[PDB]
Design a protein around this motif. Sequence first.
Motif, short mmCIF file in Angstrom:
data_model
loop_
_atom_site.label_atom_id
_atom_site.label_comp_id
_atom_site.label_asym_id
_atom_site.label_seq_id
_atom_site.Cartn_x
_atom_site.Cartn_y
_atom_site.Cartn_z
N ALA A 27 0.85 -1.23 0.00
CA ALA A 27 0.00 0.00 0.00
C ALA A 27 0.87 1.26 0.00
O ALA A 27 0.58 2.22 -0.70
N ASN A 28 1.93 1.28 0.78
CA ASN A 28 2.83 2.48 0.83
C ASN A 28 3.31 2.86 -0.58
O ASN A 28 3.38 4.02 -0.92
N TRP A 29 3.62 1.88 -1.39
CA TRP A 29 4.09 2.17 -2.79
C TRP A 29 2.91 2.57 -3.68
O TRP A 29 3.05 3.42 -4.55
N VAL A 30 1.76 1.97 -3.49
CA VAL A 30 0.57 2.30 -4.33
C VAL A 30 0.02 3.70 -3.99
O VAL A 30 -0.09 4.54 -4.86
N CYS A 31 -0.31 3.94 -2.74
CA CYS A 31 -0.85 5.28 -2.34
C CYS A 31 0.13 6.41 -2.73
O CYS A 31 -0.28 7.50 -3.07
N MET A 32 1.41 6.13 -2.68
CA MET A 32 2.43 7.16 -3.05
C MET A 32 2.27 7.54 -4.54
O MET A 32 2.25 8.70 -4.89
N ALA A 33 2.15 6.55 -5.40
CA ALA A 33 1.97 6.83 -6.86
C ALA A 33 0.52 7.25 -7.16
O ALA A 33 0.25 7.90 -8.15
N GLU A 34 -0.41 6.88 -6.30
CA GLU A 34 -1.84 7.24 -6.50
C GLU A 34 -2.07 8.73 -6.18
O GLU A 34 -3.03 9.32 -6.62
N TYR A 35 -1.19 9.34 -5.42
CA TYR A 35 -1.35 10.78 -5.08
C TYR A 35 -0.32 11.64 -5.82
O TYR A 35 -0.60 12.76 -6.20
N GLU A 36 0.88 11.13 -6.03
CA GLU A 36 1.93 11.93 -6.75
C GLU A 36 1.54 12.12 -8.23
O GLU A 36 1.37 13.23 -8.69
N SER A 37 1.39 11.04 -8.96
CA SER A 37 1.02 11.15 -10.41
C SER A 37 -0.43 10.69 -10.65
O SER A 37 -0.96 10.86 -11.74
N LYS A 101 16.61 4.08 -0.21
CA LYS A 101 17.89 3.73 0.51
C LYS A 101 18.73 4.99 0.80
O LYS A 101 19.57 4.99 1.67
N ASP A 102 18.50 6.07 0.07
CA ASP A 102 19.28 7.33 0.32
C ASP A 102 18.88 7.94 1.67
O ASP A 102 18.02 7.42 2.35
N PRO A 103 19.53 9.04 2.03
CA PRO A 103 19.23 9.71 3.32
C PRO A 103 17.82 10.31 3.33
O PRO A 103 17.20 10.44 4.38
N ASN A 104 17.29 10.66 2.18
CA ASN A 104 15.91 11.24 2.14
C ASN A 104 14.87 10.15 2.46
O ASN A 104 14.05 10.32 3.34
N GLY A 105 14.92 9.05 1.76
CA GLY A 105 13.94 7.94 2.01
C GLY A 105 12.56 8.33 1.48
O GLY A 105 12.44 8.99 0.46
N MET A 106 11.52 7.91 2.16
CA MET A 106 10.13 8.25 1.71
C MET A 106 9.86 9.76 1.83
O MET A 106 8.90 10.26 1.29
N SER A 107 10.71 10.49 2.53
CA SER A 107 10.50 11.96 2.68
C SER A 107 10.41 12.65 1.31
O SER A 107 9.63 13.57 1.14
N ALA A 108 11.17 12.20 0.34
CA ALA A 108 11.10 12.82 -1.02
C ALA A 108 9.69 12.66 -1.60
O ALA A 108 9.16 13.57 -2.22
N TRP A 109 9.07 11.52 -1.40
CA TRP A 109 7.70 11.31 -1.93
C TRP A 109 6.67 11.91 -0.97
O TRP A 109 6.28 11.29 0.01
N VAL A 110 6.22 13.11 -1.24
CA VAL A 110 5.20 13.77 -0.36
C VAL A 110 3.94 12.90 -0.27
O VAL A 110 3.39 12.70 0.79
N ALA A 111 3.49 12.37 -1.39
CA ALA A 111 2.27 11.50 -1.38
C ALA A 111 2.45 10.29 -0.45
O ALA A 111 1.50 9.76 0.08
N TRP A 112 3.68 9.87 -0.24
CA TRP A 112 3.93 8.70 0.66
C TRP A 112 3.85 9.13 2.13
O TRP A 112 3.07 8.58 2.90
N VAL A 113 4.64 10.09 2.54
CA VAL A 113 4.62 10.54 3.97
C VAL A 113 3.29 11.23 4.32
O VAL A 113 2.96 11.37 5.49
N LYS A 114 2.54 11.68 3.34
CA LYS A 114 1.25 12.38 3.64
C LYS A 114 0.04 11.47 3.38
O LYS A 114 -1.08 11.82 3.71
N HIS A 115 0.23 10.31 2.79
CA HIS A 115 -0.93 9.40 2.52
C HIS A 115 -0.65 7.94 2.93
O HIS A 115 -1.43 7.06 2.64
#
Length: 130
Positions: A27-37, A101-115
């Motif tokens: 779900a974390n990967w789906v909701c992230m792409a469902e809100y970003e694009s 895996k980078d220092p940002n992590g899911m933080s770069a994907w706003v749709a992920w940390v917010k959904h």
Amino acid sequence: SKIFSKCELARKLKSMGMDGFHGYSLANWVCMAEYESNFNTQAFNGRNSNGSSDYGIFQLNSKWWCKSNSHSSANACNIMCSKFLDDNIDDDIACAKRVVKDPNGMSAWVAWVKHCKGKDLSKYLASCNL
């Protein structure tokens, strides 16, 4: 990257090994792409926090893992941000792991940390797929 769906993107990522990847359920990967694009292959951003841009279904930030028109970038994934809005979900997922895996992590994907990471919803992949 193409016009995928909630369960379609969840089953595709699960087969590659993204299901529960680093504690991030499908779900974390789906909701992230469902809100970003919003499952749109041509959905992309032009200006970000550092003047960066997003491309593809995941809308990856072209600044910490890709070179674009954002005045140079980190290019950690070593790939220009031009071949990310195609109808194939292989390069969008290949570089997606680098953003986690980078220092940002899911933080770069706003749709992920917010959904998903921040929004604890119990109806994402639970009411999807089998």
